[PDB]
Amino acid sequence: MNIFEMLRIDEGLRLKIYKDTEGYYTIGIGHLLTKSPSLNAAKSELDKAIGRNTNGVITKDEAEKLFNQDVDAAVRGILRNAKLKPVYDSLDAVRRAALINMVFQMGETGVAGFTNSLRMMQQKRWDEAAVNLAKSRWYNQTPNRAKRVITTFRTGTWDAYK
Ligand SMILES: [Cl-]
Ligand SMILES: [Cl-]
């Protein structure tokens, strides 16, 4: 298991524009296109992202290409984030993948707001962090996925994904 397989499990793969769990237009492997209500705006962002007139459909390859960019960007976002980097640096490889998953889902900003959880993780107080992480809208809205990520932080293993 690795970050790519992990997120491919959490996000799925869809080749036609779709609405995510928040009702936003997305495509591929969890690639958000727009928070706007307009399908056109979404088709427009899509074309600009792929570089061709897609008509709201992309191939597997294109989906994977967006995915690789998005994973790269999440990592690079963490490394540039003063609140995030130090956490990330302190973690083992498995747990870093959990932090990346969160950032990919919610954005660097979103994650950087979990101040208390972050400190707990930095301190390696796993059970406590797990409990604090669960007191969030993130957990209440997407509980099955949140449980997977939380177990990952708690145990430092990939069990939740097997
Ligand atoms: Cl893009
Ligand atoms: Cl879920």
**What domains does the chain contain, in order, with CATH numbers?**
1-162 (1.10.530.40)
- The count of residues in the chain is 162
Ligand 1 centre distance from Cα of residue 104 (Å): 14
**Binding site listing:** 32, 104, 117, 132
What are the catalytic residues?
11, 20
Element (H, E) at 17: strand 14-19
Amino acid at residue number 147: K
Method: X-ray
* Least distant ligand from the CA of 150: 2
CB under 8 Å to 114, separation ≥6 — which residues? Answer: 132, 133, 136
* Least distant ligand from the CA of 34: 1
142-153 residues labelled b (16+ CB within 10 A) or e (exposed): beebbbbbbbbb
Would you tell me how many other CB atoms lie within 10 Å of the CB of residue 83?
15
Ligand 2 centre distance from Cα of residue 138 (Å): 9
* Least distant ligand from the CA of 21: 2
**Binding site listing for substrate:** 32, 104, 117, 132
Would you tell me how many other CB atoms lie within 10 Å of the CB of residue 51?
8
Q: Please answer whether residues 54 and 47 qualify as being in contact, where contact means their C-beta atoms are separated by less than 8 angstroms.
A: yes
Which residue in 149, 109, 110 sits closest to 130, CA to CA?
149
**Nearest-5° Cα angle at 15, 137 to 17:** 60
Ligand 1 centre distance from Cα of residue 118 (Å): 28
Ligand 2 centre distance from Cα of residue 142 (Å): 4
Pure H helices in 2-125: 3-11, 39-50, 60-80, 85-90, 93-112, 115-123
